[PDB]
DNA sequence: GTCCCCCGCGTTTTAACCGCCAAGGGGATTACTCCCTAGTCTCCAGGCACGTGTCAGATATATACATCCAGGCCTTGTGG
């Protein structure tokens, strides 16, 4: 699970956060030709190399382009960093993060992977 | 590709088509009677044959505008 190359502030000094099979890196996509959507939303929880500190990287756009982005620094609070990551995933997919092993598709929402 | 006009056909009904009975308008016929234009011969000027030169406009000529073909920015719209 690589750090997004567009996250240039963290790519040289951080890695994707993981615990066992629970890997906090996910790409989401909404392709719909009736509405003419073809947009992605990336979410990555990052941990710094030098210290026990965290940030949620996020990036969006139409597939093949950039839209806007965000890097939410969490000041060593992993619970806050996970809550931000999981809330954005839930809002975009209408699935809980604990349901990732049994994910189900929803109209007017992003698909996963 | 898809919007909908016109093709085909059941039900309703009125005015086109059918019988024949009236009144008289107006086209056809035969008769009246003098007005119209063909026909004669003579006069003469409208109109045509043909000299001749003014002046319209074609032929340049130098010049100023109309409008076609690239070549070149600013505001409103779609999706995020």
Chain B: bases < 7 Å from a protein Cβ: 78-80
The answer to whether some atom of strand B lies closer than 7 Å to the beta carbon of A62 is: yes
- Sign of the alpha-carbon dihedral angle for A30, A97, A68, A113: negative
Nearest nt to A41, CA vs C1'?
B80
In angstroms, how far is B22 C1' from A104 CA?
99
Distances in Å between the Cα of A17 and the Cα atoms of A14, A34, A38, A95 are 9, 37, 28, 20
The answer to whether some atom of strand B lies closer than 7 Å to the beta carbon of A37 is: yes
Whether the Cβ atoms of residue A49 and residue A14 lie closer than 8 Å to each other: yes
Experimental method: cryo-EM
């Amino acid at each position: 699970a690589p750090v997004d190359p567009e996250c240039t502030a963290k790519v040289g000094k951080a890695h994707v956060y993981c615990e066992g099979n629970d890997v906090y890196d996910v790409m989401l996509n909404q392709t719909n030709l009736r509405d003419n959507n073809n947009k992605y939303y990336l979410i990555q929880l990052l941990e710094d190399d030098a210290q026990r500190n965290f940030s949620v990287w996020m990036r969006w756009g139409r597939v093949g382009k950039m839209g806007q982005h965000s890097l939410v620094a969490c000041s060593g609070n992993l619970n806050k960093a996970k809550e931000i990551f999981q809330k954005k995933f839930l809002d975009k997919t209408k699935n809980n993060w604990e349901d990732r092993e049994k994910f189900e598709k929803v109209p007017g929402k992003y698909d996963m992977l």
